[PDB]
Amino acid sequence: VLVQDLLHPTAASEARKHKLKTLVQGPRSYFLDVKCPGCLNITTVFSHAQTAVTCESCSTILCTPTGGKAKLSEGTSFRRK
């Protein structure tokens, strides 16, 4: 306070902030590759779903929507990229 680096602020205190108030703004949602070992291939999903995403071939489910992040369905897995 009174004198500080607005240009190179600490990752942490930048981390806690709102997504619109970071130095350059950017998103905080991610994408994932989700499995349900009945199948062999892996459908990519947005961290925030709205649409209750259905798998490639089987009308199974995958995730349900929420206020924000999707609820992934029981016996599943994921990586993030």
């Binding site: 009174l2 004198v3 680096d5 607005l6 240009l7 130095l23 350059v24």
Partner: protein, 129 residues
């Protein structure tokens, strides 16, 4: 809604100074803001500033010192008729020795002394002392 983008940038600088700070993060920057920041810097009243590039419209960090009392904007960009510039600096500069009125002419965004030397005129932007 956001009206003179210049205005906010100036006012922000002034509350940093008054609060005794050394830095401002202004938003959203502009051709004009830079060229106004650019004049002050040229004459001491602030340090080094920096454009940061959000892919939007821009932010600027200004580093300032404390040589600065006030940097205001004249909110209707009035027209000034090369005679009338005398009467401006008179109304709003602390004395005849220092401080600048900066305006905008066809020949560029310049303080009034450069305006006087270049001998052109135009619209009035703001001022620094």
């Amino acid at each position: 809604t956001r009206s003179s983008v210049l205005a906010d940038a100036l006012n922000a600088i002034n509350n940093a100074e008054k609060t005794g700070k050394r830095q401002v993060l202004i938003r959203p920057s502009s051709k004009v803001i830079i060229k106004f920041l650019q004049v002050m810097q040229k004459h001491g009243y602030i340090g080094e500033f920096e454009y940061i590039d959000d892919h939007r419209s821009g932010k600027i960090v200004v580093q300032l010192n404390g040589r600065l009392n006030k940097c205001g904007v004249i909110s209707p960009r009035f027209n000034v008729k090369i005679g009338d510039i005398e009467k401006w600096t008179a109304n709003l500069l602390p004395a005849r020795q220092f401080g600048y009125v900066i305006l905008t002419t066809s020949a560029g965004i310049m303080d009034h002394e450069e305006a006087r030397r270049k001998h052109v005129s135009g619209k009035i932007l703001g001022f620094v002392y």
